[PDB]
Design a protein around this ligand. Structure first.
Ligand SMILES: CCS(=O)(=O)N1CCN(c2cc(Cl)cc(CC(=O)Nc3cncc4ccccc34)c2)CC1
Lengths: 296, 306
């Protein structure tokens, strides 16, 4: 029993974190095989990079200096070729995630991992992370069996305190750019499918006060959910929630009627899984994984 | 900016997790140097669980009865001893991945990371606190026994908890790494229950200082309070008494934000009285008590967002 915001074990990623220094800027790099990946803002980036030589980039892996033997850019990520392949390189893939999908972030400072937390890619493409100066280059990932899927690299903080970054191929999540200019997160919405997943998790953990005898149509649910800045629920979301619906005996649209009632009437002094707000940073897969005990 | 419930990176602990099997029971062990530590109830036959005589059960076991598996490698048990509620299995290989470590016993209100494990394999990491009633509100399923709680300060792993059992309310009980239970619990299946839990007042105040550092002041008020008047009000909401030690501990956060501890106490009293009125503090509609003053200083910046 119990339900926590759980991150993947970070060990496989910790062995990849390095410190990258160029000029006055120090940030984090991800060392995989013989390449160190980091935000290109450490260096017109084609014009700025052409003036740099390999020895301008100081890469430190623990108490060992790696020698940079090449450099290239891919979108907003700088790829520093080093002379040594990381012996700790795990089985990995670079994957781009969609809004609503969750991942773990290994927050680092000076190439030294400081903490691990779980978060979700918001529908507005920001992440509500916890980062200070020096955290750039910190990465987001998921683990599938023994394979690490790297999905995020931290680049910047927006004026509202939220964060923006890229996938590991340097493509930003969201309409952001990596420079000092006026940028703002768009109005965010609640990840409906994730709230429903969390309501199923609450039911599995014995919290059933919010259940009701009612059901709703998908269209009526979406009309109501649009009023509360909730993301539309699609038939794909309904299909994805099928296993949780079968386990608890609460049809997805039956849970939607519970959600509609919670949006219209509130919690009335009650909590669900120790929360007074509807939690949207657990996917249906996260709920199944935590309420089953999958290991890596 | 931002404030998350952050766990320590689990890598140093992952390299210590092993699977311990005794008869039909399989659980997790912590392999440090040439010793594997695990709950002594791995020797119980489930029937034995009401009134186990661990000394009598252990004397009947030999080294080869304990199967220890580290990854895909079987470690050979060359000795065994029991220290309180922990079994210590001496093995013939020192763990090459043993980090710099210490065994520390924590007090209620202290936070730590838990590396939840099943079959000696890490499944996830989460942050939690030792409740005032000595339980932890963890997330554990069957087979999670032997999973550990730890803090990592300056590359040294301080092991503070080992998971032993789940109480009827869904909360969890365990020991320090010397096998001493936190709380009035026993490793028996006899009826046991967590005492009424309370809110960790010093942690809520720390979290209110974290909110001020991150730029939020809506909950502040023009009042102050005496420590005694604060405690009289706080006890009515099932909050732990705030001691002069707690006030002293909050000194650095008070100096950074410019808000005296007893002025922050007055804000907390008002929050308890009024609720949040549709507002949130650091993205939460409840008063958060699983961040210590030390955690707030660790995570938040040293410059307040005035
Ligand atoms: C009727 C009395 S009682 O209800 O108060 N109770 C007292 C405690 N007791 C007991 C003691 C020990 Cl030392 C070990 C185990 C085994 C265990 O708790 N394992 C687990 C640990 N974590 C999560 C679990 C999730 C689901 C299943 C098992 C879990 C049980 C069970 C009986």
């Amino acid at each position: 029993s119990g339900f926590r915001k759980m991150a993947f074990p970070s060990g496989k990623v910790e062995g990849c974190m390095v410190q990258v220094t160029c000029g006055t800027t120090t940030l984090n790099g991800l060392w995989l095989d013989d390449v160190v990946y980091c935000p290109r803002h450490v260096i017109n980036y084609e014009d700025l990079l052409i003036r740099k030589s390999n020895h301008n980039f100081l890469v430190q892996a623990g108490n060992v200096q790696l020698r940079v033997i090449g450099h290239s850019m891919q979108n907003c990520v700088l790829k520093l070729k080093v002379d040594t392949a990381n012996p700790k390189t795990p089985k990995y893939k670079f994957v781009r995630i969609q809004p609503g999908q969750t991942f773990s972030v290994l927050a680092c400072y000076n190439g030294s991992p400081s903490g691990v937390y779980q978060c979700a890619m918001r529908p507005n493409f920001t992440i509500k992370g916890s980062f200070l100066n020096g955290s750039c280059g910190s990465v987001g990932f998921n683990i599938d069996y023994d394979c690490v899927s790297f999905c995020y690299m931290h680049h910047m903080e927006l004026p509202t305190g939220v964060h923006a970054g890229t996938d590991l191929e340097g493509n930003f999540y969201g309409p952001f750019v990596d420079r000092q200019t006026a940028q703002a997160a768009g109005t965010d919405t609640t990840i409906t499918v994730n709230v429903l997943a969390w309501l199923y998790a609450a039911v599995i953990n014995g919290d059933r006060w919010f259940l009701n005898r009612f059901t709703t149509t998908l269209n009526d649910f979406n009309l109501v959910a649009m009023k509360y800045n909730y993301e539309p629920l699609t038939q794909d979301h309904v299909d994805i929630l099928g296993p949780l619906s079968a386990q608890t005996g609460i049809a997805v649209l039956d849970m939607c009627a519970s959600l509609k009632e919670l949006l219209q009437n509130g919690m009335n002094g009650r909590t669900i899984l120790g929360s007074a707000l509807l939690e949207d940073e657990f996917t249906p897969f996260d709920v199944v994984r935590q309420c089953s005990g999958v290991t890596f």
